């Protein structure tokens, strides 16, 4: 395995075409905030968290729309092993006219572009989801 | 107004104060944004302070007093 | 000047556009030598050449100025296709064909050369100005009347809005840059808003 | 050696002037130490006196010289006998 969270977060799309509601993950400490800022912003019905031994289980329980429209409709990893990016707090980009919500590891943990203006901090912006 | 304060390892040493100081540093490339690392081989002089294979110690630039060495400090912390 | 026949390019385009009409007393079919035939189609090149060229013969300025008045129109605030229509009226020759001096711009756009060409001070012997809000284009002091300007001042009346002149001085410091409503109506702004932009 | 600039700026056929701490051997548009104001030499200006001389107070208080017959603009100021 080469990237600890790209292999995670691209099981979401492959578990978003064929319309599951299950996905099991190798959990971490990082992802137990990642899948909750997607629980804070509606994109997941219910993640519980890792509840087993030897850094084991993690399940997600996704969310689909009313007439079986997929809700998470777009997904992107941008800051990568092999090429980091680091966006300062002045030129922080919005995602799809601000509809989608990026996410950033900064001096106060992982926050988003909702929180990139009250803190006026910057960090490694790693994803874009829409 | 102060001297330089660069720190870093060595390669080896020979007779008469050949305290060469390897320094490693990061830079971006100017276009592609990759974090490329590179070194620089420096020089300073002392009595018998260092030896081969690991003599990381700060140096400080001064008046030249050599043909290539332009640092006057061998203030030692880490070694073998 | 144009040094040509403006009643021979009043049917080669669609309009005399400087009076009421000079095409009903002629063959209004086509320009010449192919008038006894049909009419073709029109592309977007037909849009640019028909509209820019149908507006150039209404303010008689030659080209290399059209771009200069185009970004001179552009270097401002608002909608561009409205603002070229806002700076279409600041020319004193336009106020010398629109404040009832003479009809055709060959004589009416010659109103700098011999007449009441003073404008709140010295004379302005050119074909325009940057005549902003609050400035009077008065009469000449040694002659407040030429031949044609006072002899045909009583020939027409009921002039345009956003201008309020008087008699016996031929002077106006009236309002401002005019409205986008009162303008030359027969043009399409967006068919020429990208024609000199592409 | 330090002097005060009177250089030929502006549109041609309209010789203007800018007032700055100059040197006797560097030319008109040459190397400039520091600015010392300007003056409208246009002879068509009512308000013209542009010398905020608190940033030019160090010149004549550390070894300046008068400049090349600009002395009547040195007349409209008064900075001498203060020391």
């Amino acid at each position: 395995m080469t990237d600890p969270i790209a292999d995670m977060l691209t099981r979401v799309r492959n578990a978003n075409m064929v319309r599951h509601e299950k996905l099991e993950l190798p959990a971490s400490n990082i992802k137990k905030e990642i899948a909750e800022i997607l629980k804070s912003e509606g994109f997941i019905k219910n993640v519980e968290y890792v509840e087993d031994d030897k850094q084991g289980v993690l399940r997600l329980f996704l969310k689909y729309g009313q007439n079986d429209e997929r809700v998470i409709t777009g997904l992107k990893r941008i800051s990568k092993p092999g090429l980091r990016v680091y966006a300062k707090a002045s030129e922080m980009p919005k995602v799809l006219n601000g509809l989608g919500i990026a996410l950033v590891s900064t001096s106060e943990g992982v926050i988003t572009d909702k929180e990139a203006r009250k803190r006026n901090v910057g960090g490694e912006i790693i994803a874009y989801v829409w | 107004n102060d001297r330089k304060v660069y720190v870093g390892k060595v390669v080896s040493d020979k007779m008469d104060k050949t305290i060469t100081v390897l320094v490693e540093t990061y830079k971006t490339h100017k276009l592609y944004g990759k974090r490329v690392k590179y070194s620089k081989k420096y020089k300073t002089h002392d009595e018998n302070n260092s030896a081969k294979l690991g003599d990381i110690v700060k140096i400080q630039e001064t008046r030249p007093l050599s043909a290539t060495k332009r640092f006057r400090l061998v203030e030692i912390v880490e070694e073998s | 000047r144009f040094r040509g026949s403006n009643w021979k390019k009043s049917r080669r385009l669609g309009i005399s556009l400087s009076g009421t009409g000079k095409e009903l007393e002629k063959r209004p079919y086509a320009p010449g030598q192919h008038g006894p035939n049909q009419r073709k189609k029109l592309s977007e090149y037909g849009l640019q050449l028909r509209e820019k060229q149908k507006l150039r013969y209404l303010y008689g300025m030659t080209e290399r100025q059209f771009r200069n008045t185009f970004d001179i129109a552009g270097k401002k605030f608002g909608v561009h296709g409205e603002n070229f229509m806002i700076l279409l009226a600041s020319r004193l020759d336009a106020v010398v064909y629109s404040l009832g001096l003479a009809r055709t711009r060959r004589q009416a756009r010659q109103l700098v050369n011999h007449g009441h060409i003073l404008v709140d001070g010295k004379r302005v012997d050119i074909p325009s100005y940057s005549v902003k809000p609050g400035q009077t284009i008065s009469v000449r002091e040694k002659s407040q009347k030429l031949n044609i300007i006072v002899e045909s001042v009583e020939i027409n009346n009921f002039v345009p809005e956003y201008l309020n002149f008087d008699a016996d001085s031929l002077t106006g410091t009236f309002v401002r840059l005019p409205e986008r409503s009162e303008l030359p109506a027969e043009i399409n702004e967006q068919l020429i808003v990208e024609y000199y932009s592409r | 050696a330090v002097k005060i600039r009177l250089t030929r700026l502006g549109s041609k056929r309209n010789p203007f002037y800018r007032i700055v701490v100059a040197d006797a051997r560097s030319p008109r548009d040459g190397r400039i130490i520091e600015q010392i104001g300007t003056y409208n030499p246009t002879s068509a200006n009512a308000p013209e006196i542009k010398v905020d001389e608190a940033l030019a107070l160090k010149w004549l208080n550390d070894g300046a010289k008068p400049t090349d017959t600009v002395h009547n603009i040195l007349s409209k100021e008064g900075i001498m006998k203060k020391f």
């Binding site: 509606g42 809700v71 799809l96 006219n97 509809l99 | - | 909608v79 561009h80 808003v193 932009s197 | -």
Partner: protein
């Protein structure tokens, strides 16, 4: 009522035992100016009514374009086949900036303010389908809040 603009025609042949025989194809696009756009393709041995043969084929299916007030909501790149378009919103007074075919599906639509550029190929049968695909992928700014469960204010 409804406006119907021809984008292009083409003279299309077929070889049989004798000389080859011709027929004209003519795709047309039908716009309704409130943001509902269809398109169709005509195939007959004449110009001036194979147009109508396509126009009756165009109204049978439409797409509901998301008008934001004089514009499009966000940035999208609808591609279909090798051709592609680059769509981008702009200020309310801008005009429309597009190529040949991809303004015949925008001014015949009701958007009037887009910066755009074609990419990839340039044959007019692949431009329009990728543009319509791009307009289907666009979403309103309120139904995202509906499936999200947020309000409109909570996103900003």
């Amino acid at each position: 009522e409804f406006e119907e603009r021809v984008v292009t025609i083409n003279r299309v042949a077929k070889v049989v035992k004798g000389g080859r025989r011709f027929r004209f194809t003519a795709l047309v696009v039908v716009g309704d100016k409130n943001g509902r756009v269809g398109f169709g393709t005509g195939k007959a041995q004449e110009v001036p009514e194979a147009i109508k043969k396509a126009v009756e084929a165009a109204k049978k299916d439409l797409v509901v374009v998301p008008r934001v007030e004089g514009t499009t909501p966000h940035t999208i790149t609808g591609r279909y086949g090798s051709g592609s378009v680059f769509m981008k919103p702009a200020a309310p007074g801008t005009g429309v900036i597009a190529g040949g075919p991809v303004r015949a599906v925008l001014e015949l639509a009701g958007i009037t303010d887009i910066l755009s550029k074609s990419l990839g190929s340039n044959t007019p049968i692949n431009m329009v389908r990728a543009t319509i695909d791009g307009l289907q992928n666009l979403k309103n700014a309120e139904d995202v809040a509906k499936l999200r469960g947020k309000t409109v204010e909570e996103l900003y």
